C-alpha cells in the first residue's frame, strides 16, 4: 500500500496473508469469509505470463496478523489449504476478468479478537454502496511504493471512481465484473495498492447495519499510485453466484 498508514490492532480481522513456503515470502493478500473459506485473486495462484501456478501444498494461510515478518505467537493462526478453486472463466489472457479464487482450509480457524470474517454483499448492498465517490478501504502488506516494505499491515481509504473515468485511464478492456478506485490528480490526497496487496479486500462499512462488507478484491493497476491511473478491483457481488456455488457444492 502506497501512502497508507499503519493499521490499528484488530482493525482488519478478516485480513489473510498468503505465505509462500520455500522460499518464505509474501505471496498475496486474501480475506476470511467463514471459518473454512478464504477469498483471494486468481492471479495470486495462477498467472502463466509470470509462471505462477501454485498448488495447495505450496503455501500457507496466516490469519490474525499485524506484523509482516514476525511469527505472531498466540495471535496469528496458520492454516493449511485443502483445496483451491479458481473461477473457470478467469481471463488471465486479456484483462484479469473474474480475478477471483477460493480456498478451503484443512480445519476450521478459531475466531478471536484478531480473527473474524468479513460479510459478502448481496444485490441490495451492492446497489447502495458501489457508487462513485463512496469510499472503501484497502489493506495489505505489499510494497510502500512502485520502485520499500512495511513493518506492519497498511491501510488506505479510497473513493470509487466513475466508470467512464476508469475506462479512459487505461488501454485494457474494463468489464462489468471490475470497478476502479483511487483519487484523481487534482484531489490533494493519494494512495493505492502495490506489489503484494493483490487478493486483499476492498471493504466498506454499511451505514444501515454497521457491518463491514467486502465489495472488492485487489486485482491490478498500471504501476502503483500514479497520477491519472486507478486500481482495478474484482466486483465481489457480481461473482457471488459462483462463490455460493463453490461453497454449497464443496
Amino acid at each position: 500500500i502506497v501512502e497508507g498508514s499503519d493499521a490499528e490492532i484488530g482493525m482488519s480481522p478478516w485480513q489473510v496473508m498468503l505465505f509462500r513456503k520455500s522460499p518464505q515470502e509474501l505471496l498475496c493478500g486474501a480475506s476470511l469469509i467463514s471459518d473454512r473459506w478464504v477469498l483471494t485473486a486468481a492471479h495470486c495462484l495462477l498467472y502463466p505470463p509470470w509462471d505462477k501456478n501454485f498448488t495447495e501444498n505450496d503455501l500457507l494461510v496466516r490469519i490474525g496478523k499485524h506484523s509482516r515478518t514476525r511469527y505472531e505467537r498466540n495471535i496469528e493462526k496458520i492454516s493449511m489449504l485443502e483445496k483451491i478453486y479458481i473461477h473457470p472463466r478467469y481471463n488471465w489472457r486479456e484483462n484479469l476478468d473474474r480475478d477471483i479464487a477460493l480456498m478451503k482450509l484443512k480445519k476450521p480457524v478459531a475466531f478471536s479478537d484478531y480473527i473474524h470474517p468479513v460479510c459478502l454483499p448481496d444485490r441490495e448492498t451492492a446497489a447502495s454502496l458501489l457508487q462513485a465517490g463512496y469510499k472503501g478501504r484497502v489493506t495489505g502488506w505489499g510494497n510502500l511504493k512502485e520502485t520499500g516494505q512495511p513493518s506492519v499491515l497498511q491501510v488506505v481509504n479510497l473513493p470509487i471512481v466513475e466508470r467512464p473515468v476508469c475506462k479512459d485511464s487505461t488501454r485494457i478492456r474494463i468489464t462489468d465484473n471490475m470497478f476502479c478506485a483511487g483519487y484523481k490528480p487534482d484531489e490533494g490526497k493519494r494512495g493505492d495498492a502495490c506489489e503484494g496487496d493483490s487478493g486483499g479486500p476492498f471493504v466498506m462499512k454499511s451505514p444501515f447495519n454497521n457491518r463491514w462488507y467486502q465489495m472488492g478484491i485487489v486485482s491490478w493497476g498500471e504501476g502503483c499510485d500514479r497520477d491519472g491511473k486507478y486500481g482495478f478491483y474484482t466486483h465481489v457481488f457480481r461473482l457471488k453466484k459462483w462463490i455460493q456455488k463453490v461453497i454449497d457444492q464443496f
Partner: peptide
C-alpha cells in the same frame, strides 16, 4: 450471523481512526 463486526471495534462500540471518513462519503 456475526460477519463484519470487529471484536475490538463494533463489538465494543469503539470507532477506528478513519471509518468516519468512509461514513462521510456515503450520502
Amino acid at each position: 450471523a456475526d460477519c463484519g463486526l470487529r471484536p475490538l471495534f463494533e463489538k465494543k462500540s469503539l470507532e477506528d481512526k478513519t471509518e468516519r471518513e468512509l461514513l462521510e462519503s456515503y450520502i
